[PDB]
Design an enzyme around this catalytic site. Sequence first.
Site, PDB file in Angstrom:
ATOM      1  N   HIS A   1       8.452  -8.952   4.602  1.00 44.14           N
ATOM      2  CA  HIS A   1       8.700  -7.525   4.419  1.00 44.14           C
ATOM      3  C   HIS A   1       8.625  -6.792   5.759  1.00 44.14           C
ATOM      4  CE1 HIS A   1       4.296  -7.729   4.626  1.00 44.14           C
ATOM      5  NE2 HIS A   1       4.453  -8.750   3.803  1.00 44.14           N
TER       6      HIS A   1
ATOM      7  N   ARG B   1       2.840 -18.174  14.248  1.00 44.32           N
ATOM      8  CA  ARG B   1       2.082 -18.021  13.013  1.00 44.32           C
ATOM      9  C   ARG B   1       2.901 -17.301  11.947  1.00 44.32           C
ATOM     10  NH1 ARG B   1      -3.081 -14.619  11.013  1.00 44.32           N
ATOM     11  NH2 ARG B   1      -3.552 -14.246  13.227  1.00 44.32           N
TER      12      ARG B   1
ATOM     13  N   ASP C   1       3.224 -15.338   8.482  1.00 44.03           N
ATOM     14  CA  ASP C   1       2.467 -14.510   7.550  1.00 44.03           C
ATOM     15  C   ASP C   1       2.954 -14.707   6.118  1.00 44.03           C
ATOM     16  OD1 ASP C   1       2.540 -11.509   6.113  1.00 44.03           O
ATOM     17  OD2 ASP C   1       0.614 -12.018   7.036  1.00 44.03           O
TER      18      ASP C   1
ATOM     19  N   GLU D   1       0.152 -19.475   7.609  1.00 42.40           N
ATOM     20  CA  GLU D   1      -1.061 -18.910   7.031  1.00 42.40           C
ATOM     21  C   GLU D   1      -1.059 -19.037   5.511  1.00 42.40           C
ATOM     22  OE1 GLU D   1      -2.283 -15.206   8.724  1.00 42.40           O
ATOM     23  OE2 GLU D   1      -4.318 -15.696   8.066  1.00 42.40           O
TER      24      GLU D   1
ATOM     25  N   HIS E   1      -8.550 -12.417  10.767  1.00 44.13           N
ATOM     26  CA  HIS E   1      -8.438 -10.956  10.726  1.00 44.13           C
ATOM     27  C   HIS E   1      -8.635 -10.466   9.302  1.00 44.13           C
ATOM     28  CE1 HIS E   1      -4.665 -12.145   8.961  1.00 44.13           C
ATOM     29  NE2 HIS E   1      -4.494 -10.899   8.554  1.00 44.13           N
ATOM     30  N   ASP E   2      -8.350 -11.362   8.380  1.00 40.67           N
ATOM     31  CA  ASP E   2      -8.385 -11.106   6.956  1.00 40.67           C
ATOM     32  C   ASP E   2      -9.749 -11.234   6.257  1.00 40.67           C
ATOM     33  OD1 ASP E   2      -7.710 -12.037   4.011  1.00 40.67           O
ATOM     34  OD2 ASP E   2      -5.946 -11.008   4.817  1.00 40.67           O
TER      35      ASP E   2
END
Lengths: 469, 469
Positions: A125, A206, A208, A238, A320-321
């Site tokens: 997105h 990476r 997402d 990820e 980060h999550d």
Amino acid sequence: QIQTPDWVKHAVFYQIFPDRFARSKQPRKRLLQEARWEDWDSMPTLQGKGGDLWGIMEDLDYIQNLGINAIYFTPIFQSASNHRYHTHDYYQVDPMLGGNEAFKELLDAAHQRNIKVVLDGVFNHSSRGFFFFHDVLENGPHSPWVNWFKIEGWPLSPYNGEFPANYVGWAGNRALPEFNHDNPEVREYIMEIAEYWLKFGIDGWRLDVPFEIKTPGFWQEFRDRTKAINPEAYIVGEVWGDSRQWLDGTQFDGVMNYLFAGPTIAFAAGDRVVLEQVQSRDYQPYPPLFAAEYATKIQEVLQLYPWEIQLTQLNLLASHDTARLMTIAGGDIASVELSTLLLLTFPGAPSIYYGDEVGLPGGIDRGFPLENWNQEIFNTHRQLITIRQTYPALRTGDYQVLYAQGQLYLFARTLGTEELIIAINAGTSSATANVDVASLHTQPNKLLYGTAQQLSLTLPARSGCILGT
Amino acid sequence: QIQTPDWVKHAVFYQIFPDRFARSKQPRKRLLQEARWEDWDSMPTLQGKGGDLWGIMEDLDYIQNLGINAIYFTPIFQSASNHRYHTHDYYQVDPMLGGNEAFKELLDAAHQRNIKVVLDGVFNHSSRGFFFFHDVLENGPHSPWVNWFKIEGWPLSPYNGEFPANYVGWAGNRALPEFNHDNPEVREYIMEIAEYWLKFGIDGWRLDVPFEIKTPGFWQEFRDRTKAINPEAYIVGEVWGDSRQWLDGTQFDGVMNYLFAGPTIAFAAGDRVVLEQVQSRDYQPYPPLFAAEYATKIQEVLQLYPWEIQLTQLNLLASHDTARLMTIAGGDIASVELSTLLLLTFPGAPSIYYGDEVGLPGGIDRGFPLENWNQEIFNTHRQLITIRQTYPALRTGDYQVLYAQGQLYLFARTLGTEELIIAINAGTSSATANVDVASLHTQPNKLLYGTAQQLSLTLPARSGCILGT
């Protein structure tokens, strides 16, 4: 035949959230590069404290000294403030972070020090400003790119929450409009983005939430084009969970191994895990595990993917999550040291989240690590990284559980002649194990870390050690 | 000391609306340059008819053959479809037109043929997708660029017309959010855009509604930086009206002279002007004028600006903003030929609107000129351009009214020894003038165009001629 980058098998990764890493130690002309100093004060936005890519470049001393040889970021492409995951322009590093110029300098400074750089690709997105979606908001039904997204009806309501958006957004959020990947055009566009940055010089991608792009053949093509530009390029998904679907050798080189993080923390931290602080969507560091339980699920995890891919997995304990290490374990230092030990002695590339290495706290949504160190936790990291870069067995060696009873765990990593024994006592009391180690041709009796064919190993409470030879 | 580009004083400009000029004669991979032909049919947007920059490059034969040596465009930067005046990204030529790649090829192809290229700069406002405004729509009060625009209150209503926008848009339109030029940052940003394209290689700037940017010192700085990158760069303001404010020598080299267009048409077309077809905001080609009246207002227009600047004015008879020549005059061919004659014999650079040269119609909001020519009108253009490029006096020579009585107008252009007499009989009947021409040292008796110190000149009705020597 399955083949993954070799440099990754021997790297130590370091995940950075650039916005909140480090400010440059110099006044910087971000955005308006031509502006003259006399005007500095007239320019409120430039004159007046977030982190940027200059900053990271300036702190390459620290990063390299930690033992890091590859840093990978959260999304750094142009996007609205505090919304880096809502891409505006994929061909431009965000102005506030220093733009392509700052990125180019950091990129070179890293490579000069032989440190790799991997970028985050948010391809499921974009945002409401992303050009082609912009055109749809301006031209509605008449826009030629309607089919680039997932419109459900007219009219669209991009910013007024009182009416139905009428277009699909990630997690039902209007600011995150999804792409119609089934559209060969959208796909070609994604691929071209991927190729561009690799040509620019990045050391890979990476990905997402890649599991949202379900179009068949999408990720194999991604791998094909990617490696075409750079055969040594590192493609990491990820993905939280069983990733066999993407780890057959035709797609990713590996994924961020949350399957490793969950059990590792559940064993090292045990019932000390602070539940209200766990991003349960990513991993499950609960219920607490006994040595024998950690041992079986870890082996189950080690036989999930082809060995060549297991060696290029991105093992981690935080992102980060999620919450930081010190926070997920209620400040229990032993949980940090024990967890980090298991991380730096696991097959596959280890990833350290910026801040963890100095005991920095962090819940599930704090930064600027180089600003009160936990010296102890810092030394554990640096030392363990030095040890991992010193013995090949700890990187690409095999993995053998030697003993797993009670709260005491022992395994060995072996490469050719090299045989290493790693021990973990997660218990609150001193413990000793008697093991028949006939799988080894040597008798590791030297302490390479910590304090401690028939073997009798005694470990203090909440401690771990590494035995050499 | 006042100085304007010399090449402009001898150029013949040709205004093109790229979207609607010419399609490339080849299937083109616009946007997705990496896409393979096998997928062409799978890609509806690429596979399936507007004009583009490829097309113009391919028609450089025609343009050069017309006698053109400089083309300038409407806005060509990335923007939503059918809304080129709502800029999305100023650093990118719109994808559909072929992007920077197509522009780069056209640019080179032109320069190889010694044809200049001038771009339109829309710096008073952008669009809702323009990155920094995007950030404001996403972050509202917290956006760091609030002060880059003209916000009036919260919350903003970008797309829902049922509520007040709460931010200033050009002509009160929400899609055209205005810039706060008073902000030194916005200004620096505009300047950097201007510099970029000049470095890219363009031959200067058309300035859209520059009279809206009122910040003092803004346009002098614009001129300073511009010429810094390219001292020969042509800065033209699109200003309808007395432009002395910007034509003092420190800002523009000239403006699109609608002050010339109004009277010229009012005299050549007279009461044949179709009122409901005149963009009265730009020019006033009414009420009809008698020779003596055209003569006084034309002299008034010739003494309005410094001579060096008058020589670099962009004289025209039509623009993207007005109706075409054939349309403004109810299809009256003589009005076209007579008007074009006055245009190609006026001091300052002449500008021909694409299509006019083939008699193409056009009201106030039709294209693709190379697709039924009016041969007569075409020959008038080509011939007159050849004649203008053949005699220096017609370009930089002085201007002297010789006779203006009834519906018959005579003037001379002189440069050194060269003396040319131009005559216009706008009347419906044959006419003759007896003039004492003692200002000339020669006796122009040769017809260089048309059919016809004491002189007796007889002209057929609705006709003009050029006398040489």
